[PDB]
Design an enzyme around this catalytic site. Structure first.
Site, PDB file in Angstrom:
ATOM      1  N   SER A   8       0.855  -1.180   0.000  1.00  0.00           N
ATOM      2  CA  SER A   8       0.000   0.000   0.000  1.00  0.00           C
ATOM      3  C   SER A   8       0.892   1.230   0.000  1.00  0.00           C
ATOM      4  O   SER A   8       1.667   1.432   0.940  1.00  0.00           O
ATOM      5  CB  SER A   8      -0.937   0.003   1.214  1.00  0.00           C
ATOM      6  OG  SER A   8      -1.756   1.161   1.241  1.00  0.00           O
ATOM      7  N   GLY A   9       0.790   2.040  -1.056  1.00  0.00           N
ATOM      8  CA  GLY A   9       1.544   3.278  -1.124  1.00  0.00           C
ATOM      9  C   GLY A   9       1.137   4.315  -0.101  1.00  0.00           C
ATOM     10  O   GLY A   9       1.856   5.304   0.074  1.00  0.00           O
ATOM     11  N   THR A  23       4.025   4.915   3.140  1.00  0.00           N
ATOM     12  CA  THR A  23       4.490   6.297   3.104  1.00  0.00           C
ATOM     13  C   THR A  23       4.185   7.016   4.412  1.00  0.00           C
ATOM     14  O   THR A  23       4.987   7.835   4.878  1.00  0.00           O
ATOM     15  CB  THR A  23       3.864   7.037   1.925  1.00  0.00           C
ATOM     16  OG1 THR A  23       4.098   6.296   0.721  1.00  0.00           O
ATOM     17  CG2 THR A  23       4.482   8.420   1.784  1.00  0.00           C
ATOM     18  N   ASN A  25      -2.202  -5.353  -7.486  1.00  0.00           N
ATOM     19  CA  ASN A  25      -2.055  -4.036  -6.878  1.00  0.00           C
ATOM     20  C   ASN A  25      -2.109  -2.987  -7.977  1.00  0.00           C
ATOM     21  O   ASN A  25      -1.378  -3.084  -8.965  1.00  0.00           O
ATOM     22  CB  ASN A  25      -0.736  -3.930  -6.096  1.00  0.00           C
ATOM     23  CG  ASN A  25      -0.683  -2.715  -5.174  1.00  0.00           C
ATOM     24  OD1 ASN A  25      -1.115  -1.619  -5.532  1.00  0.00           O
ATOM     25  ND2 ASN A  25      -0.142  -2.911  -3.980  1.00  0.00           N
ATOM     26  N   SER A  33       1.613  -0.668  -7.793  1.00  0.00           N
ATOM     27  CA  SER A  33       2.703  -1.457  -7.242  1.00  0.00           C
ATOM     28  C   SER A  33       4.035  -0.848  -7.650  1.00  0.00           C
ATOM     29  O   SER A  33       4.297  -0.659  -8.842  1.00  0.00           O
ATOM     30  CB  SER A  33       2.597  -2.904  -7.721  1.00  0.00           C
ATOM     31  OG  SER A  33       3.676  -3.682  -7.239  1.00  0.00           O
ATOM     32  N   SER A  34       4.869  -0.529  -6.666  1.00  0.00           N
ATOM     33  CA  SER A  34       6.211  -0.034  -6.943  1.00  0.00           C
ATOM     34  C   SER A  34       7.068  -1.175  -7.472  1.00  0.00           C
ATOM     35  O   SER A  34       7.172  -2.227  -6.832  1.00  0.00           O
ATOM     36  CB  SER A  34       6.827   0.564  -5.683  1.00  0.00           C
ATOM     37  OG  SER A  34       6.954  -0.416  -4.667  1.00  0.00           O
ATOM     38  N   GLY A  61       7.167  -6.400  -1.688  1.00  0.00           N
ATOM     39  CA  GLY A  61       7.275  -7.626  -0.933  1.00  0.00           C
ATOM     40  C   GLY A  61       7.016  -8.860  -1.785  1.00  0.00           C
ATOM     41  O   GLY A  61       6.885  -8.814  -3.008  1.00  0.00           O
ATOM     42  N   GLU A  93       5.525 -11.906  -3.757  1.00  0.00           N
ATOM     43  CA  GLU A  93       4.415 -11.945  -4.702  1.00  0.00           C
ATOM     44  C   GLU A  93       4.028 -13.383  -5.005  1.00  0.00           C
ATOM     45  O   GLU A  93       4.871 -14.179  -5.432  1.00  0.00           O
ATOM     46  CB  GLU A  93       4.767 -11.225  -6.006  1.00  0.00           C
ATOM     47  CG  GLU A  93       4.514  -9.729  -5.977  1.00  0.00           C
ATOM     48  CD  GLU A  93       4.693  -9.085  -7.335  1.00  0.00           C
ATOM     49  OE1 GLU A  93       4.704  -9.818  -8.345  1.00  0.00           O
ATOM     50  OE2 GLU A  93       4.832  -7.846  -7.392  1.00  0.00           O
TER      51      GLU A  93
END
Length: 953
Positions: A153-154, A158, A204, A207-208, A430, A432
């Protein structure tokens, strides 16, 4: 209270992940349990049952102190704390935080002061404690720190980073408005990196696809001097192809649908359905507009300070990256040399990238290779030319991204104060686990497997320091080695070559295919411990710390290809475009994505192993961003991925529940009542005496210097016996007080001193009826509840305290009540007969008293008369009086003797007094009347003589 008698366990639950159940019976490999909620009996598998912690372990702040260390107990401990407002919970080294989706009063300046210098156990779990202990460890140990944060979760990750920085900006700043500028710029760099580094996946929406390492720099005295951003493991393969429902990086869609018609023309932008590199077309992100996000992304760059012509360089390269995928090579007739019949895409690529189209065309089709001393042009097939164009696009996007990170650091690290130490905040994608796990998921899971190995080793070092402080012998191998076989399964170059090495070999053979690669993995690695065959679309399975993960090796060969055309790299290095030239200033193929990934991860792991690592686990509670709602399976899934359960596995294998000597004795001395002398001072030897009294196996405990270390489940059993023993003491205490009441009440009921009055006897009747109404029923209920306790206590006894003896003693009490009430009725009848006889006895005397007095008054007149006949008339009434007394005397005396005889039958006390009162009356009053009666008769004779003498004359 009676929790130990219910045999409560954890069983799986579709709704709540796990739920309590009462274990009733085991049938082979299965068990019959009764669900506490609805009381229905279900049959479950014995290996699906997980032990439950005693109630004492309620909302524990460190879940490494649980005596039952399993996922059902971890979920329950996190759930209860969450619904109590506690989002932070320690799990060994982990700091688990579950997103509350609320503004909590736990981030005030007054709470920052309560955490300065404090240790983890001295305060409730909090991100401030992780930040303080890291900062204080940086200044004491004089080594750099890292805070490894996971989560999908961004917003949650954060906000956690914002708290870490705020705590450091408060506790380590020297001067307010200047005190929050570091946070102000970082919140402006997040959207810039997000547009270029994040992407919508099948799981997601944001997703980063890289690892961000935010370093907070400090001088030698501990004051913040600056901050910069490092990036790692950028998923550049996403620029050329994406899976179903997945997007490439956000910036591509922002530009294609957010640019005006004039920017489209200048950048040669085309509709979505003309770029091969956009696999699924314009996949949209729910509740978000690609057109709108384009302005916000450009807005953030203007705020950061990036000039116009540098932003155009980024948009232009983006357009160039897309155009590379539009180049089409074709195999010509009967020749392995590739051809490019249409050069429209190459003209656009060459215009956007500032190179010559003829140099570019010649350099991909017939590149020069340095042989000996001279450049020799070599042919290229369509496959070689395609992989070269794809490798050129992947390399350009990565260089553009790294340049952007350097450009952002130019805004951040503006002073370049160069500090003596740093605290790094790592934000990486993280673990996957998708329905279809491909090459990218193997690279991701490979990274997190080594990151979790960094945790296990860090826990190993700290645990080894604790055992030596307590003098307990250390006989454990490194906890990070438990993950080594899975790591070597993937990364090991030779010996047993890893999956990445086997993939490289297939990528370097001509006839090799995806099937032939799986064949080589099956035959050469099917014997590996962490390797398993699927059971069934997937090709092979890997046993990660997060459990078994299935993989599908479709297109892995083409995904692993990364051959950089050194001819084109020179052209791009010599680009006329100043931006492209800047991206390719450091230049100069058996080159694979897998081998390039290992080196990037090695650069990261080297950075981390030179710091002290801290670990924070951000967990999503639900998919609806709601507050106070918890999705148990969503939380369970994250717990299996983030390695929380991996740490729980570790301390479950050792001695995790350390107990101080005085606390252990105070808690469990009821189990060991006669093994410690009364004047015993040595608290350590007292625990030795208690443990020796319990026959605990020497493998269950370790005696230390201040604590005794116990295996898992040991405290669970002792707590069970503690509750089982104190319910026994409550039984014996109540049973004694009940029997002693029954004996005392029966001894009272056996009394026959009911007083000597009608009001005295009836009062004891009212006491006996009030006893049976108010005092007896409460005792009768105690008889039943004690028998229920005893039978319960007997399945999971001084003389007189068993239910069968109490039942007989109670029956003797009811028999005592039987004779007591009958004796009272016998006495009440006796008291009434006495009162009636005493009233009738005193009645006869009072009748004789007034009779003796009134008649003596008449006799006292001595009326003789005036004539002879009148004197004889007086004699007529006198003999009537004489005969009347003889009848009244015998009648009363007979009735008075009868009453005295009846009172003797009733054992009356004052019978001799009544008899004297009658003998006194007859001797005094009554004989006086009889004596006065004859005196009257003699008077009536003395006159009767002289009256007859007068007549004779």
């Amino acid at each position: 209270a009676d929790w130990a008698a219910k045999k409560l366990v954890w069983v799986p639950s579709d709704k709540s992940g796990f739920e309590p159940a009462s274990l009733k019976e085991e049938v082979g490999e299965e068990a019959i349990v009764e669900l506490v909620e609805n009381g229905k009996k279900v049959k479950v598998n014995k290996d699906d049952i997980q032990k439950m912690n005693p109630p004492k372990f309620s909302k524990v702040e460190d879940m490494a102190e649980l005596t039952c260390l399993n996922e059902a107990s971890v979920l329950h401990n996190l759930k209860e704390r969450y619904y109590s407002g506690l989002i932070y919970t320690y799990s060994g080294l982990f700091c688990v935080v579950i997103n509350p989706y609320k503004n909590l009063p736990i981030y005030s300046e007054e709470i920052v002061e309560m955490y300065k210098g404090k240790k983890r156990h001295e305060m409730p779990p909090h991100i401030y404690a992780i930040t303080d202990t890291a900062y204080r460890s940086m200044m004491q140990d004089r080594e750099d720190q890292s805070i490894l944060c996971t989560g999908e979760s961004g917003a949650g990750k954060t906000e956690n980073t914002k708290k870490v920085i705020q705590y450091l900006a408060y506790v380590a700043s020297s001067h307010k408005k200047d005190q929050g500028e570091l946070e102000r710029q970082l919140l402006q760099a997040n959207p810039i990196l997000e547009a270029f580094g994040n992407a919508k996946t099948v799981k997601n929406d944001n997703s980063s696809r890289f690892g961000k390492f935010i370093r907070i720099n400090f001088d030698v005295n501990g004051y913040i001097v600056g901050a910069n951003i490092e990036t790692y493991l950028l998923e550049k393969s996403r620029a050329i192809r994406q899976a179903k429902e997945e997007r490439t990086f956000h910036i591509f869609y922002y530009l294609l649908s957010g640019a005006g018609e004039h920017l489209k023309t200048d950048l040669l932008l085309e509709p979505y359905n003309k770029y091969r590199f956009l696999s699924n077309g314009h996949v949209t992100i729910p509740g978000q507009q690609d057109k709108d996000m384009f302005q916000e992304t450009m807005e953030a760059m203007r705020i950061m300070g990036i000039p116009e012509e540098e932003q155009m360089g980024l948009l232009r390269v983006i357009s160039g990256v897309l155009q590379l995928g539009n180049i089409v090579f074709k195999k010509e007739r009967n020749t392995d040399q590739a051809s490019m019949p249409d050069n429209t895409a190459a003209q656009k690529v060459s215009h956007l990238l500032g190179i010559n189209v003829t140099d570019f065309t010649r350099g991909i089709l017939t590149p020069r290779i340095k042989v000996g001393r001279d450049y020799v042009q070599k042919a290229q097939t369509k496959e070689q030319a395609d992989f070269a164009i794809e490798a050129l696009a992947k390399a350009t996007y990565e260089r553009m991204f790294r340049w952007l990170v350097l450009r952002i650091n130019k805004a951040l690290d503006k002073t370049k104060r160069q500090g003596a130490s740093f605290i790094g905040i790592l934000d990486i994608a993280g673990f996957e686990i998708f329905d279809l796990n491909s090459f990218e998921q193997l690279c991701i899971n490979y990274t997190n497997e080594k990151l979790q190995q960094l945790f296990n080793h860090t826990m190993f070092i700290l645990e080894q320091e604790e055992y030596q402080r307590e003098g307990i012998e250390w006989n454990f191998i490194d906890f990070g080695l438990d993950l080594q076989p899975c790591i070597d399964l993937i990364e090991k170059p030779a010996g047993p070559p890893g999956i990445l090495a086997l993939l490289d070999e297939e990528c370097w053979f001509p006839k090799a295919t995806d099937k032939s690669f799986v064949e080589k993995v099956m035959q050469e690695q099917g014997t590996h411990p962490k390797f398993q065959k699927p059971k069934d679309k997937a090709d092979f399975c890997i046993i990660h710390y997060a459990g078994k993960v299935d993989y599908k090796a479709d297109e892995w060969l083409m995904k692993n290809m990364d051959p950089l055309n050194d001819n084109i790299a020179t052209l791009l290095h010599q680009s006329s475009d100043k931006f492209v030239s800047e991206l390719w200033k450091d230049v100069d193929m058996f080159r694979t994505v897998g081998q390039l990934y290992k080196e990037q991860l090695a650069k990261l792991m080297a950075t981390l192993r030179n710091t002290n690592p801290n670990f924070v686990r951000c967990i999503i509670p639900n998919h609806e961003k709601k507050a106070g709602k918890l999705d148990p399976h969503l939380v369970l899934d994250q717990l299996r991925c983030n390695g929380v359960l991996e740490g729980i596995r570790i301390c479950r294998q050792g001695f995790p529940n350390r107990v101080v000597f005085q606390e252990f004795r105070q808690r469990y001395e009821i189990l060991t009542p006669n093994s410690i002398p009364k004047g015993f001072m040595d608290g350590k030897q007292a625990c030795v005496l208690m443990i020796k009294a319990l026959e605990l196996d020497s493998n269950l405990y370790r005696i230390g210097q201040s604590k005794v270390f116990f295996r898992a489940g040991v405290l669970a059993h002792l707590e069970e016996e503690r509750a089982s023993e104190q319910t026994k003491s409550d039984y014996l205490k109540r049973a004694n007080e009940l029997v002693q009441w029954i004996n005392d009440k029966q001894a009272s009921l056996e009394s026959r001193d009911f007083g000597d009055s009608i009001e005295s006897v009836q009062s004891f009747m009212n006491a006996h009826k009030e006893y049976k109404k108010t005092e007896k029923p409460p005792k009768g209920q105690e008889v039943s509840e004690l028998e229920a306790i005893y039978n319960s206590l007997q399945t999971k006894a001084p003389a007189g305290l068993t239910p069968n003896e109490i039942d007989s003693t109670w029956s003797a009490l009811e028999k005592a009540e039987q004779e007591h009430a009958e004796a009272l009725r016998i006495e009440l009848k006796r008291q009434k007969k006495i009162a009636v006889l005493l009233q009738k006895y005193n009645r006869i005397l009072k009748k004789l008293e007034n009779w003796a007095t009134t008649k003596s008054v008449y006799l006292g007149s001595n009326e003789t008369g005036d004539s002879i006949t009148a004197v004889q008339a007086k004699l007529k009434n006198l003999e009537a009086f004489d005969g009347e007394c003889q009848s009244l005397e015998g009648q009363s005396n007979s009735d008075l003797l009868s009453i005295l005889a009846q009172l003797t039958e009733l054992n009356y006390n004052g019978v001799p007094e009544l008899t004297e009162r009658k003998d006194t009356f007859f001797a005094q009053q009554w004989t006086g009347v009889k004596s006065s009666a004859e005196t009257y008769k003699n008077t009536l004779l003395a006159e009767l003589e002289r009256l007859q003498k007068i007549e004779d004359a």
